[PDB]
């Protein structure tokens, strides 16, 4: 229950550039004397609301914005106070992603979307469409290679194919999400997931595939294509596979529609250092030099900060990220997103593993996503002197 005054503790995921961020920390230290400690706890997207509930945890938490509505409703997040002058340094759509009840609850950092990453040597002309991948694998199997391998354990990676033809999470109508209009059941959703399963049935993919299997598969040059975000680039860089980053294949003539995540920095509600956090975030991290220190450790992709994005977008890989970003949809941040992810994660794994048909798997995911009247997030089911905790 103590966060410790006069110090900044920052949490950020392990695939991001925490050492780069840590050096922004050291710069902050020599300028102000405040010590900055960067940690990358595992599953920090769940570790955070778990420790922050009783007022413990880091001063600053990084994740895609989707989870931040959820944290905010649980009161785990401070309202941030950037003046109009700082707000203009960033693209307006990124601020829209950090809103909850009209209030800004985090600082946007990077704009993330999955792209198609291909081995240029194995495959000089990557597929425009999902449909031509099965035949492209047969060819590649003849030379002891596969066409495509990406993470199937995380619905984030499988969502772009599901939504291509009209699958959607919650319907966005007149400025608001309608949590009774759920589209994980519709024909577009089923068309995508059926296609992914048929890929697995015809021995072109393994239901078995997870992030680190697919990564090593691509970085060892054994598969021609992978699907991943900018974070994955640095491991591909060191491996010296000759790789390109480009548009995701179309499905049924429609673009794949990745869920765009705005990587964001939140300030713990329970933190005694909310001013030191604002200053670090506004004056050190969200500067050209700040974002570059992180970026040189592990690429952020496109960034919310205008001045630096204009430099980064010159890189054909970031151009690709943006193009894919523009063809997708910005994720909701509503508290129910947690329920949804769990739901789709289950549907994707059970349909792909065979334990359920596509129709059964998505019907379940749709049931588990729909009547979420006052979905809670951290349900304690306990009273303390006749009252709930928090």
């Amino acid at each position: 229950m103590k966060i410790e005054e006069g110090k900044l503790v920052i949490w950020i995921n392990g695939d991001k550039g925490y050492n780069g961020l840590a050096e922004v920390g050291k710069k902050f230290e020599k300028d102000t004397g405040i010590k900055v400690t960067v940690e990358h706890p595992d599953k920090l997207e769940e570790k955070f609301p778990q420790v922050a509930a009783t007022g413990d945890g880091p001063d600053i938490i990084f994740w895609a914005h989707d989870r931040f509505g959820g944290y905010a409703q649980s009161g785990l997040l401070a309202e941030i106070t950037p003046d109009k002058a700082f707000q203009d340094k960033l693209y307006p759509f990124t601020w829209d992603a950090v809103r909850y009840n009209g209030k800004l609850i985090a600082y946007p950092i990077a704009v993330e979307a999955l792209s198609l990453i291909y081995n240029k040597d194995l495959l000089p002309n990557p597929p425009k469409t999902w449909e031509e991948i099965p035949a492209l694998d047969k060819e590649l199997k003849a030379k002891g290679k596969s066409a495509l391998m990406f993470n199937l354990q995380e619905p984030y990676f499988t969502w772009p194919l599901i939504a291509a033809d009209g699958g959607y999470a919650f319907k966005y109508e007149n400025g608001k999400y309608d949590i009774k209009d759920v589209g994980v059941d519709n024909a577009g959703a089923k068309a995508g997931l059926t296609f992914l399963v048929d890929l697995i049935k015809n021995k072109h993919m393994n239901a078995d595939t997870d992030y680190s299997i697919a990564e090593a598969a691509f970085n060892k040059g054994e598969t021609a294509m992978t699907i991943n975000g900018p974070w994955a680039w640095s491991n591909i860089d060191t491996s010296k596979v000759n790789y390109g980053v480009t548009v995701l294949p179309t499905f049924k003539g429609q673009p794949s529609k990745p869920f765009v995540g705005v990587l964001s920095a939140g300030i713990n509600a329970a933190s005694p250092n909310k001013e030191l956090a604002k200053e670090f975030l506004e004056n050190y991290l969200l500067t050209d030099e700040g974002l570059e220190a992180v970026n040189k450790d592990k690429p952020l992709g496109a960034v919310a900060l205008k001045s630096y994005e204009e430099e980064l977008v010159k890189d054909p890989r970031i151009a690709a990220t943006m193009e894919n970003a523009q063809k997708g949809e910005i994720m909701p941040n509503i508290p129910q997103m947690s329920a949804f992810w769990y739901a789709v994660r289950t549907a994707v794994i059970n349909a792909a593993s065979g334990r359920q048909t596509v129709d059964e798997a998505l019907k379940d995911a749709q049931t588990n996503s729909s009547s979420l009247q006052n979905f809670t997030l951290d349900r304690s089911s306990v009273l303390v002197d006749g009252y709930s905790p928090n």
């Binding site: 609301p49 951290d378 349900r379 306990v382 009273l383 006749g386």
Partner: protein
């Protein structure tokens, strides 16, 4: 901090008799917000895990025959079986949920003429030793539910041990185990655990994992599914 008495402690009836069981608490259990009384009733038939009968004092759980009936207000609660039957031989427990969780001492009733939860990992230990009990969950969105550990000790003693919230932020232990025990969950592997250290011989019991129920009308503040008890014996 809340004490519960149940009268009578045992009871022998012929088939068909109407039966009333008492439960009294050291203090009022009324939820100032929901106006529900934080009292629930459980049935433990011989050789089985307890099951939910009544919650919110007077609401019958789905599946429970309507001869079971809960009533009461203030500090005074009653479970009535209008005309008892052979299948009702069981110990009956009131449980309060107004301030943490406490089970009553129980009423032994005798007659004279896809939601699954599986525990694992019980065993023997010397006093001061260790064990970690687990409970694997299936048939529901485990991520959405608070889970609790309850243990049954040799002298008809049903005890709450710990509860962990659906996302783990809120954890609570019985005095009897505070410090020595640690309740954890893994929402990714659909799993609940109780690390038991510095074991007393009084910690010897069957240990149940139980799901805290809720619905469209609010939290049940009651446990609506139980696993079979894994057994923990601390033998001097």
């Amino acid at each position: 901090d809340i004490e519960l008495t149940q009268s009578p402690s045992s009871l022998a009836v012929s088939a068909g008799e109407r039966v009333t069981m008492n439960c009294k608490s050291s203090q009022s259990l009324l939820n100032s917000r929901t106006r529900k009384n934080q009292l629930a009733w459980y049935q433990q038939k011989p050789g089985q895990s307890p099951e939910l009968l009544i919650y919110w004092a007077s609401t019958r759980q789905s599946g429970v025959p309507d001869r079971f009936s809960g009533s009461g207000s203030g500090t005074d609660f009653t479970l009535t079986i209008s005309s008892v039957q052979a299948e009702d031989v069981a110990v009956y427990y009131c449980q309060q949920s107004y301030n943490l969780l406490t089970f009553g001492p129980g009423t032994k009733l005798e007659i004279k003429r896809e939601v699954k939860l599986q525990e694992s990992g019980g065993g023997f230990v010397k006093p001061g030793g260790s064990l970690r009990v687990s409970c694997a969950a299936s048939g529901f969105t485990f991520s959405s539910y608070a889970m609790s550990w309850v243990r049954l000790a040799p002298e008809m003693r049903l005890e709450w041990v710990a509860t962990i919230s659906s996302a783990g932020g809120y954890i609570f232990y019985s005095d009897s185990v505070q410090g020595r025990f640690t309740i954890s969950r893994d929402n990714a592997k659909n799993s609940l655990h109780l690390q038991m250290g510095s074991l007393r011989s009084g910690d010897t019991a069957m240990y149940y994992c139980a799901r805290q129920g809720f619905g469209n009308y609010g939290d049940y503040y009651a446990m609506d599914y139980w696993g079979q008890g894994t057994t923990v014996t601390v033998s001097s």
